[PDB]
Every structure is written in C-alpha cells, then in structure tokens.
Write a protein that binds this ligand. Structure first.
Ligand SMILES: O=C(O)CCC(=O)N[C@@H](CC(=O)O)Cc1ccc(-c2cccc(Cl)c2)cc1
Ligand SMILES: *[C@@H]1O[C@H](CO)[C@@H](O)[C@H](O)[C@H]1NC(C)=O
Ligand SMILES: *[C@@H]1O[C@H](CO)[C@@H](O)[C@H](O)[C@H]1NC(C)=O
Ligand SMILES: *[C@@H]1O[C@H](CO)[C@@H](O)[C@H](O)[C@H]1NC(C)=O
Ligand SMILES: *[C@@H]1O[C@H](CO)[C@@H](O)[C@H](O)[C@H]1NC(C)=O
Ligand SMILES: [Zn+2]
Length: 696
C-alpha cells in the first residue's frame, strides 16, 4: 500500500532531508519540519535570505540564463530584442571601459548634482524650480522624489485612471532607519559614506578639486534633509485603511489646502502636473480630479521645504537617482556601494551578473521572457489541474461563510457575490506563445545597442514612465496580466478582484500533477486560499466584486470583523525575533498577510478533507511514518525552510508586509485545531495555545 514511483521517492527524500525528526512536533513545528535543512545549510555570501523559496527563485534564474544567452534562428524580433538587452547587460568589459562617462553625460538633463558640479548656482540656478526639477526625475526617469505623482487605477472607479499624490520613498529601507541609533547606526554611516564616495568618484573623473570636509558637510546636510522628510511621512500603520487614505480632490482644492514654498517660490501644483503630463501630450486644468494619499505629509512638508535652498534639494534629488544608477556603471562605481549593501542586506558580495541581467530583462520584457520561460519549463497541462483546485477552494471559501456566526446574512450574501466574482489567471497568457506579432508590437519603440547597457536602461526608464502616464485618459485593460509568467510568486488584485498564479509557482514543492495531493493542497492549495482570502482581509473587504472601493459591510459585521482580527495583531505582535535583535513583529503591517495565511490554511485543509472523502486515502510515502494529514502540514511548513541575515531581518521586519517564514508557520499552526489533532498535541503545548485566532 506504498507508493514507489520515481516522483514519490523524490517527494519523500526532500521531506526527509529537510525535517529533523528528533524535535517534538508540538514544541516547535518549524524546527520539526525544517531542522534538517537549517542544520545543513549556510546562507550564500550573496543572499540576504536563503531557503527553499529562494532556491526556487535561483533555479528559475538558471532557466532564464539558458533561454537568453544563446541566439537561435527561429527567434522572433521580440525575443531578439530581449537577448540583445541581455548581451548588453552581461558585457562588463564594455561597461567597465566606459567608467562613469554615461552618467556624466546624463547629469545636466537632471540639473546636475551640486556637490559634483562647481558653480552649480551659476550653471543651473536661474532656470531651476522645484516643479521642473522634481518633474524631470519623475516624467523622464520614473524617479519619485519629495512629492510622488503617478497615474493609477481609481480606487473608487476601477475602469479608470486618475493622478495620485503620495509621500515619496526614502533612500534607506524605512523611516525607522532615520533615528540612526543602535541597530540603524551602521546603515546611516554607510548611507552617508556611500554618498560621499560617489561624489568623490565623480569629482575625480570630471578632474575637479576634492575638499573632503566639503563632501562631509554637504552630504550630512543631505542626510539631515532626508531625516526631516522621513519624519514627515506617515507610518505604514496609518496607511492601511484604504478608505481613510483615499482623498479625491481637484488641483484647485489642492492649491489652497496644500500650498508649499520652495526656495521662496512658491509651488504651483498645476505647473508641476503639466510638466509631468505634457511628456505625453495631455494638458491639465484645475478641473482635474486628483486622489491624495498623503495630505498630512504635504502639510508637514511646508515648514520643512521653506528651510532649504535649491542646491540643498537638488543634492538629495540627484543622489536618489544616482544611487540607483551606480551598479550600472564601472567596477569602480560598483564597489562604492559595498558597505551600503552590507548594512541593508548583510551581503558581502553582489549576486552574479548573469543573475541580475536575467532579472532585469525579465522585469522589463515580461511577455517575451515569460514566453521563453514557459516554452522551456512549464507543462501547460498543469493549467487544467490548477483550474480545478481553484474551483474546489473557491467552493470551500463560500461554504465557510455559512458557519460564520459573527457575520450577518446580508453581509454573508455580498461576500459570496465577490467570491463567485473572483477572476483567475493561470500559468501564462496564451498571447505570448500563440501571437508572435502582438508580442513584437509591444516592444516596437525599444531599440537596444549591444554595447550601450546604460543607454538601454535609460531608454527603459522613459518607456515605462511614458506607458504609465499615457494611461490617464485610458480605460483599465481587462485582459492585462498583473504579473509575468516567469515569477515564483502569486497575486491578488483588489482593483480587478482577480487571483494570479504564474508558471513560476506551479512546480514542486507547491505543485505537481505527479505528487501526492496532500502535498498539492498543502502547497499551491494553501496559496490559492491565501490569495482568495486577500479579497477579504483588512484591505480587500473594502473592495467589491468589481474592484471598486465601496463599503459593503453592516456596522456590526465590520465591527465584529475587527474584533476577530484584533486577536492576530496581538498574536503576531508578540512574536519576537532573535535575528532582528529581539524586536517584535508589527502585527498591524502584517495583519493582512497573517489573515490570508490563516484563512488559506483552513480552506486548503478542508478541501483536502473533501478530497479524501470523495476519493479515499492516498498511497503512503516510503521512509515517512506519517499519514497524509500530517504530510499536508509538513510540506506546508517546508515551503518556509530558510533563514535570514541579521541585517536583512532588521530591514524586513520594518518593510515586509509578510511575517518571517518561521512565524508564518508557527502563527498559522498555533491557530489550527486541525494541526494539533493531526499531531496529537497536548493542550497548552507551544504549538497548541488555548486561545486561537479565527477570522475566515
Ligand atoms: O518570498 C517572499 O518574500 C514572500 C512570498 C509570498 O508569501 N508570496 C505570496 C504573495 C502574497 O502575499 O499574496 C504567495 C504565497 C506564497 C506562500 C504562501 C505560504 C505557503 C506555505 C505556508 C504558508 Cl504559512 C504560506 C502563501 C502565499
Ligand atoms: C564586449 O565588449 C565589446 C562591445 O563593443 C566587444 O569587444 C566584445 O565583442 C563584447 N564581448 C561580448 C561577449 O559581447
Ligand atoms: C517629527 O514630527 C512631529 C509632528 O510633526 C513633531 O512632533 C516633531 O517636530 C518631528 N521630530 C523631528 C525630530 O523632526
Ligand atoms: C511652468 O512654469 C515655468 C516658469 O516657472 C514656465 O516656463 C513653463 O512654461 C511652465 N511649464 C508648463 C509645463 O506649463
Ligand atoms: C501582546 O499580547 C497582549 C495580550 O494579548 C496584548 O495586550 C499586547 O498588546 C500584545 N503586544 C503586542 C506588541 O502586540
Ligand atoms: Zn499575501
């Protein structure tokens, strides 16, 4: 009664090798599931995090290398363009021989970098306004500094786009880093040294004098400016109510309630919008509707932006771009980032060039590279099997609603509408395989020179930003996939109410028509549940079946929802993480993900119970004295075998909306009565707390 296929053997070995059978399952299921893997693996010098999930991403990269590095007769123009981009990217001896010159040529188009220009005021002062400086970085290069302006889907009207105004991102990973004490100190030091070093390299190249004390003073000014911007931005916890974030206005209204004075100007929102929007032949009047995500921030900016000169601001604005571009230049410029990378990620070296190149071209040519990938790696048959899993799990979710005693009947019915309404996307869009010419047309405006990597990425910057801006007066495309196919991940989009499962994720350990179904439900099954559940988390529940941000909850049901979910805030907020210096997770920032992990697990396990009930028990696995209910949980846990560099734990605990893997595994299993039964856990054993959190 034992499976002895080749596939069963591979499943078995992997499970056996990862686990540590000498830990007790009810003490620490993560150790039990992953202890073997932990004992045996070291984090590569180039990874900030390592583990089964990252290995999957590393192996996907290998496939990409194989499909990009070799020209073939039969290659369509779209594919040709992608391989050309790749070749430009991996030719380091061409890149190296150009030193910093490509960047130098670019510098005047952004109003220079004051610290590395002499007589900056003389050269740029008369013609410099915030409106145009900021606009330039935004419209031409996709770089958002100080004020973030973008075109995106209207939250309250999902068939349309609108302009958005939000707070910008920071050079360091989060606002927390800007306190610059304790765990953040080295990052602040590296950050300022990084600026110093780049300005010193550019000064050496242009043949200009170098006063070291001037560099220190000017760059620390940059940090002091960015420290004040960091302080002005809203915490992620004060941004997670999508209802309270959305503030539709007019540029008219915005000029009153949110005035600024920069270099004693003062600022013109209307000038600013047309500077950006003119980049694609669309002009704007005070009529225009504008969604404002950071009203408090704009207010907090007024007293700050009056204190700094054009030279002070341009120093930061430029640095924030330059920062991004430095790895794209010569070896000399590449080194300047070393300490900065180490302080944020813990990595002592950059990842292989071919790897960064594969990721770069994937990210800029997702349909072309997705096509190459799926032809090389993805079954295609898998698609129907996964389709049926989604139906089973969509089903379960709907049924679970009727056992929700805390939700009223009208809210129950409206939840069911959205569930039936969820659109799924599996593997890849067929277009990319079956319609060569359409794929060719997508990349029509792109022309890459093979020995001009930098010009290539600059061209890529403009093309992306142009595509995005030109959408303002356009209706949201329905058939558009929110991810390329060569991705090891999955997605839910509230704005389309759709779930996405790329080819990249439809492989072991998540999925294989050739692995036990206990593994399949435990893996991709859980992920399906996780993504359906996103439709209904602290964020998704605010969005209806059509992706529009409308309240469809009765006071009571919503209010009860918040009670149930308060449990998980406290559960996860009380996990504390050794790797991150004993800091505790943010139970609010990670709430949505934690809700989705917990929901997903229940649905996937109930679907597997349904499957056993409809089909009977599956053949056992050789070497493993576990039944299939236990195997479901094992595989489920081993998705997250892995570990973090302390540097990157410090980072991710402030920036990741997911809890760290160990804690996702602990948190979900602790809340699962079903887990403790499968594993026969003593009450109040660590894996089996008395209080259990439940929402879906
Ligand atoms: O790699 C990263 O940094 C994040 C990966 C990441 O979570 N992606 C998700 C994208 C998202 O959030 O919908 C898709 C996803 C992947 C794995 C799991 C899973 C599997 C087994 C057990 C548990 Cl407790 C969770 C749940 C969701
Ligand atoms: C890299 O650099 C230059 C491009 O002009 C040239 O000498 C050489 O052919 C290139 N090498 C490769 C492998 O592309
Ligand atoms: C940060 O912002 C708050 C509110 O505007 C204020 O109490 C304080 O002045 C700011 N702190 C620093 C160090 O700039
Ligand atoms: C914005 O203002 C400047 C002067 O401050 C002016 O020269 C320019 O025409 C305006 N830009 C746009 C895009 O209307
Ligand atoms: C930890 O749990 C307690 C009791 O549930 C709760 O009152 C407290 O706020 C939690 N702490 C965090 C940081 O979430
Ligand atoms: Zn998620």
């Amino acid at each position: 009664g034992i499976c002895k296929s080749s596939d069963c053997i591979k499943s078995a070995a992997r499970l056996i090798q990862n686990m540590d059978a000498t830990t007790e399952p009810c003490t620490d299921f993560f150790k039990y599931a992953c202890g073997g893997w932990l004992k045996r693996n070291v984090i590569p010098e180039t990874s900030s995090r390592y583990g089964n999930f990252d290995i999957l991403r590393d192996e996907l990269e290998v496939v990409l290398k194989d499909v990009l590095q070799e020209p073939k007769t039969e290659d369509i123009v779209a594919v040709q363009k992608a391989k050309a981009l790749y070749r430009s990217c991996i030719n380091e001896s061409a890149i190296d021989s150009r030193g910093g010159e490509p960047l130098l040529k670019l510098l005047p188009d952004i109003y220079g970098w004051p610290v590395a220009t002499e007589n900056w005021e003389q050269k740029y002062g008369a013609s410099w306004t915030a409106e145009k400086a900021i606009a330039q970085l935004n419209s031409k290069y996709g770089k958002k500094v100080l004020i973030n302006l973008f075109v995106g889907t209207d939250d309250k009207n999902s068939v349309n786009h609108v302009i958005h105004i939000d707070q910008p991102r920071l050079g360091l990973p989060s606002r927390d880093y800007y306190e610059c004490t304790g765990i953040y100190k080295e990052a602040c030091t590296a950050y300022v040294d990084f600026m110093i070093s780049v300005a010193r390299l550019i000064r050496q190249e242009e043949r200009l004098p170098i006063d070291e004390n001037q560099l220190a003073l000017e760059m620390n000014k940059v940090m002091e400016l960015e420290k004040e911007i960091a302080n002005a931005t809203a915490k992620p916890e004060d941004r997670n109510d999508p209802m309270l974030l959305y503030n539709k206005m007019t540029l008219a209204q915005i000029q009153n309630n949110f005035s600024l004075e920069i270099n004693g100007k003062p600022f013109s929102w209307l000038n600013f919008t047309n500077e950006i929007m003119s980049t694609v032949n669309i002009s704007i009047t005070n009529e225009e509707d504008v969604v404002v995500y950071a009203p408090e921030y704009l207010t907090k900016l007024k007293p700050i932006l009056t204190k700094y000169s054009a030279r002070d601001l341009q120093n930061l604005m430029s640095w924030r771009f330059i920062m991004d571009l430095v790895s794209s230049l010569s070896r000399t410029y590449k080194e300047s980032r070393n300490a900065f990378r180490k302080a944020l990620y813990g990595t002592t070296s950059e990842t292989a060039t071919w790897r960064r190149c594969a990721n770069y071209v994937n990210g800029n040519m997702e349909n072309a590279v997705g096509r190459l990938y799926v032809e090389a790696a993805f079954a295609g048959e898998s698609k129907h099997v996964v389709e049926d899993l989604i139906a089973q799990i969509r089903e379960v979710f709907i049924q679970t609603l009727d056992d929700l005693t805390w939700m009223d009947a009208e809210t129950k019915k409206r939840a069911e509408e959205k569930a039936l309404a969820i659109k799924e996307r599996i593997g890849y869009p067929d277009d990319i395989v079956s319609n060569d010419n359409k794929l060719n047309n997508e990349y029509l405006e792109l022309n890459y020179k093979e020995d001009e990597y930098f010009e290539n990425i600059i061209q890529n910057l403009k093309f992306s930003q142009s595509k995005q801006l030109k959408k303002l007066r356009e209706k949201v495309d329905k058939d558009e996939w929110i991810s390329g196919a060569a991705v090891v991940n999955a997605f839910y989009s509230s704005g389309r109410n759709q779930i996405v499962f790329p080819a990249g994720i439809l492989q072991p350990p998540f999925f294989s028509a050739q692995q036990s179904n206990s593994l399949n439900y435990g893996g991709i099954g859980m992920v399906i549940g996780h993504e359906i559940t996103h439709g209904f988390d602290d964020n998704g529940r605010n969005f209806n079946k059509d992706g529009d941000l409308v309240d469809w909850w009765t006071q009571q049901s919503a209010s009860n929802f918040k009670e149930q979910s308060q449990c998980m805030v406290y559960q996860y907020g009380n996990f504390s993480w050794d790797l991150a210096g004993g800091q505790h997770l943010n139970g609010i920032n990670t709430l949505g993900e934690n809700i989705a992990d917990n929901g997903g697990l229940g649905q996937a396990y109930r679907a597997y119970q349904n499957y056993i009930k409809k089909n009977g028990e599956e053949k056992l696995l050789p070497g493993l004295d576990l039944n299939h209910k236990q195997l479901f949980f094992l595989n489920f846990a081993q998705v997250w075998c892995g570990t973090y560099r302390p540097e990157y734990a410090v980072n991710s605990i402030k920036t990741d909306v997911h809890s760290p893997g160990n804690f996702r595994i602990i948190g979900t299993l602790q809340n699962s009565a079903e887990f403790s039964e499968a594993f026969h856990c003593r009450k109040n054993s660590y894996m089996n707390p008395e209080k259990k959190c439940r929402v879906w």
